[PDB]
Structure 1
Amino acid sequence: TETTSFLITKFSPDQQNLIFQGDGYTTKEKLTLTKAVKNTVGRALYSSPIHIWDRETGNVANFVTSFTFVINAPNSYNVADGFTFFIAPVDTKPQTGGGYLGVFNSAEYDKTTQTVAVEFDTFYNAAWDPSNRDRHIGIDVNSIKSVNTKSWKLQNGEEANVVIAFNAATNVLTVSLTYPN
């Protein structure tokens, strides 16, 4: 059996257990991925590699992650790109920026990307986002073109509570986002 757990309820300026990429950094007790500036990318990864499936046994891990995040845009009409929680190879570096969310490089399935992401997408990319043009949550598998999406109304500046859980017996990934009002 192998378990990994961590809880961080307030970030420190020297958070040595995180890996920061691009614009990512900590403090005001918070983790900042991007400031409100154009054409940028920030990522933050947990330091320890996680054993998510076992080659010997073929077992796959159950996991749950909870986090609170905020998007703060100058006006709620012009926001861009979005945010993701992602699972990727151990030595991942930032992928394409902008609509690709720093996690993918195409809208076609690329098996070498080897990444699963839960996206909170704030900008409609005609090439691949839902034609309703709504902001949305999406499950992404080796492509920026989600396997499934749900329309989501962004509450600018509000804390969003998210829970993402994976059930190994069923291979079901569940995502929940909750705003207090």
Structure 2
Amino acid sequence: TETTSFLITKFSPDQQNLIFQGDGYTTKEKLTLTKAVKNTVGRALYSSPIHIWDRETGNVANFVTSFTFVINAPNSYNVADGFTFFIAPVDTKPQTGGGYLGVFNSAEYDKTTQTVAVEFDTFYNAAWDPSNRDRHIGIDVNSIKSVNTKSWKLQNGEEANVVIAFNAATNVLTVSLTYPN
């Protein structure tokens, strides 16, 4: 049996158990991935590698993560690109930026990427996003083009509470985002 847990209700200016990439940093008790500037990327990863499945027994881990994030845009019409929670190889660097959200490099299935991500997409990219043009939550597997999505109405500046859980018995990944109002 192997378990890994951690909880951070308020970030410190020197959060040494986190790895920062791009514009990522902590300040004012919060974790800032990007400020309101153009063409940029920021990432933050938990320091310790996680044992998600066992080669010997073929067992896969159950896991649950919960977090509160905020998106602050200059207005409600021009918002981009989004935010993700992701699972990737141990030594990973930022991938393509913009609509690729820093975790993928194409809309076609690339098995070498070895990345699963839950996206909170705020900008409609014609080449691959849902034709309805709505902002949306999506589950991504080795591709920026989600295997499934759900229209999501962004509440600018509001705290969104997220729970992402994985059930190893059924291989089901569940995502839920809740706004207090």
Instruction: Give the TM-score range, shorter chain.
Output: over 0.9
Q: Give the corresponding residue for 1:60.
A: 60
The reply to whether residue 169 of structure 1 matches residue 169 of structure 2 is yes
Distance 1:87 1:80 in 2: 22
**Structure 2: unaligned runs, 5 residues or longer:** none
Q: Structure 1: 5+ residue runs without aligned partners?
A: none
Give the aligned length: 181
Q: 5 Å matches for 1:132-147?
A: 132-147=132-147
Rounded to whole Å, the distance in 1 between the matches of 2:157 and 2:92 is: 29
| Inter-partner Cα distance in structure 1 for 2:64 and 2:27 | 25
Verify: 1:120 aligned to 2:97, yes or no: no
SS state of the match for residue 55, structure 1? coil
Find the counterpart in structure 2 of residue 75 from structure 1.
75
Task: Give the distance between the partners of 1:103 and 1:137, measured in 2 at CA.
Answer: 15
Tell me the CA shift for residue 93 of structure 1.
0.3
Q: Distance in 1 between matches of 2:27 and 2:39?
A: 22
The SS at the match of 1:112 is helix
Report how far residue 120 of structure 1 moved.
0.1
SS of residue matched to 2:99: helix
Per-residue deviation at 1:38? 0.2
Q: Name the CA distance, whole Å, in 2 between partners of 1:51 and 1:92.
A: 16
Query: 2: CA distance between counterparts of 1:39 and 1:100?
Result: 12
**TM-score normalised to the size of structure 2?**
1.00
TM-score by length of 1: 1.00
Deviation by residue 1:103-156 (Cα, 9 ceiling, x = unmatched): 000000000000000000000000000000000000000000000000000000
CA RMSD of aligned residues (A): 0.2
The structure 1 segments of at least 4 consecutive aligned residues displaced by more than 3 Å after TM superposition are none
Show CA shifts across 1:53-83 (max 9, x none).
Answer: 0000000000000000000000010000000
Deviation at 1:92, TM superposition (A): 0.5
* Aligned counterparts of 1:35 and 1:114: Cα–Cα separation in 2: 28
1:27, distance to aligned residue in structure 2 (A):
1.1
| Superposition deviation, residue 37 in structure 1 | 0.1
Q: CA deviation at 1:12?
A: 0.2
